[PDB]
Write a structure and sequence with these properties.
homodimer; alpha+beta; Rossmann fold; D-amino Acid Aminotransferase, Chain A, domain 1; Dna Ligase, domain 1; 3 domains; six-stranded antiparallel beta sheet; 22% strand; globular; binds adenosine-5'-triphosphate; binds cesium ion; binds magnesium ion; cell wall biogenesis/degradation (chain A); peptidoglycan synthesis (chain A)
Chain lengths: 326, 325
């Protein structure tokens, strides 16, 4: 096999360990020769055996090479940026790879930045006619103006793995929840809490003609789908396909493929939905979904007849068929 | 306090020559020690004296160092990216500076990529309640669907300096206008042409919560505010403050700062407006406006009491206020 892929995992985001968990899942199944590069939590890079060493530790606090790393970029045909969250999924790493001229897996700069921002993405989706949960954006220092009644969900505008997210019951608790989210981002969203709710997720694969995976449902007993529930094995109940009627599942896939085109995503995406009182709401769209043992995106496509190595192979091919079209 | 600025100009976008003119304006008024780095049209970088030599030539087709350049970044305290257009104003260069850790003038990755897309910005601004011109997006290869009557304006979605823009009077001319636009971007926008139209411009300075300049109005005798009109001296008149009705100036400034806040722009932006039949429309936000001799952003704030050196001082200063957060 002549194809050579550079996998980049880790990062300075709070999802650093999740990224390393995703690297292990991709390295186990990718059918091409693949080297790993790890971004440590201090921003410095680890290469070669030191990157594989940090992968066994499932955490990399300190690195060796400051950015830009002395990496032989001409060795690799495709770069796989497996960096969840800030400085990896928000367009920053994508912009660096665009200047290197390398083909890379996943969405481009604008689509990565647009989808990581829980406020700007909802504005675009609401403008295209996609149903979303009522919300408002709160900037740091600016007092909150919430035109709907609690319960709320307070999130950092650019977050992942449910980090910094709080379920708020009384308006008294809003200022403390906003202060937690402001630890992770200068901007936060306050969303109306759907109670009760079912959580549905669909994977999308493709550049121009994206195709949807079967609809899956996630169930749990924690207050919400939080960090511990997402990544502790066995804590989350992953139901594929979702025990819904076919009509709702078809509508979920229709909405996912539409949001995929509206937001300009290419490569891949996991689209999360809320089902409450028969009404569908698009929650978010993740351009670099997790590939951890408890993650949903790889399982969603295996049920659809696309095995784990076939999914990763099509991700790498899509990065090349997009690059050739300039 | 020590302050050494690295100025980056040139670039691979069609506005390459315009960027070098902006660098000459910035270097003539910036109050800090400032080195120049030139990105040639081939993507390779020119450093030091070769960057100054290419500045005198007003064009740099070929460069020396492939990306990333062997630049001594540690020598500089703020990076001033002055690259108009794609690969400079659209978040790509900003992402490299973020990973670099050096503070930089202007909008971040998200705000740059959003303002540089004439379709994405209009989607966000229309949802936020900002009035915008009726528009539609066309992808290269897809057949267009323009649900409104001509005249149109056809634009590359990522264009600047009126490059690739056509005024379309007949439907039989749409195909040629799209083929022209698709030379510069894989996505194009088709907008309902306002005729007649007055053009208003207002500058913003600040991080997210901006400070608005006086409103200025551009006059010209060309068919539209095209490339030759934008950069040939004397072809464009700037009337400050714009001859506007009571409260109309305030409304323009309110919309400018509102779009600035929604999109979360940092540093600066020039916000362009259309005035047609008493109605206001938001045209675009340019995060890296021109600093060329005929550009309006320094003149808008000069009329507001912020001189050219003070304007550049606050821009460098705002880059550190965000970085120190
Ligand atoms: N409006 C809401 N109503 C009910 N529950 C919500 C709402 N918003 C968020 N939640 C709960 O909080 C969890 C996290 O929400 P969200 O998907 O925004 O977090 P995230 O970190 O972006 O997720 P991911 O890890 O997929 O990126 C959801 O799985 C859901 O269970
Ligand atoms: N919808 C419209 N109706 C009427 N005139 C228009 C319209 N769109 C563009 N124009 C004319 O074309 C010119 C350029 O439009 P636009 O500002 O979109 O180009 P640009 O390349 O973004 O300009 P800049 O150099 O400010 O970036 C405008 O100044 C205006 O004169
Ligand atoms: Cs996201
Ligand atoms: Cs809203
Ligand atoms: Cs713009
Ligand atoms: Cs539209
Ligand atoms: Mg998410
Ligand atoms: Mg989620
Ligand atoms: Mg512009
Ligand atoms: Mg303009």
């Amino acid at each position: 096999m002549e194809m050579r892929v550079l996998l980049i995992a880790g990062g300075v985001s709070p999802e650093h360990e999740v990224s390393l968990l995703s690297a292990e899942g991709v390295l186990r199944h990718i059918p091409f020769p693949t080297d790993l590069a790890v971004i440590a939590q201090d921003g410095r890079w680890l290469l070669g055996e030191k990157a594989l060493t940090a992968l066994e530790a499932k955490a990399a606090p300190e690195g060796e090479h400051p950015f830009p790393p002395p990496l032989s970029w001409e060795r690799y045909d495709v770069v796989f940026p497996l960096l969840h969250g800030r400085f990896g999924e928000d367009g920053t790493v994508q912009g660096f790879l665009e200047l290197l001229g390398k083909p890379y897996v996943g969405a481009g700069v604008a689509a990565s930045a647009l989808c990581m921002d829980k406020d700007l993405s909802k504005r675009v989706l609401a403008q295209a006619g996609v149903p979303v949960v009522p919300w408002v954006a709160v900037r740091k220092g600016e007092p909150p103006v919430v035109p709907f009644d609690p319960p709320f969900f307070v999130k950092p505008a650019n977050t992942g793995s449910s980090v910094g997210i709080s379920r708020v019951e009384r308006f008294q608790d809003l200022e403390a929840a906003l202060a937690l989210a402001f630890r992770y981002d200068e901007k936060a969203v306050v969303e109306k809490a759907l109670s009760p709710v079912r959580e549905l997720e669909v994977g999308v694969l493709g550049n121009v003609f994206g195709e949807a995976s079967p609809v899956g449902e996630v169930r749990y007993e924690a207050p919400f789908y939080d960090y511990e529930t997402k990544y502790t094995p066995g804590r989350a109940e992953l139901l594929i396909p979702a025990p819904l009627d076919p009509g709702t599942q078809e509508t979920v896939q229709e909405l996912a493929l539409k949001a995929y085109k509206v937001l300009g995503v290419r490569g891949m995406a996991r689209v999360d939905f809320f089902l409450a009182e028969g009404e569908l709401y698009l929650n978010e769209l993740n351009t670099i979904p997790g590939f951890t043992p408890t993650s949903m995106y790889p399982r969603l496509f295996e049920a659809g007849g696309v095995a784990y190595p076939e999914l990763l192979r099509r991700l790498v091919e899509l990065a090349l068929t997009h690059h050739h079209h300039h």
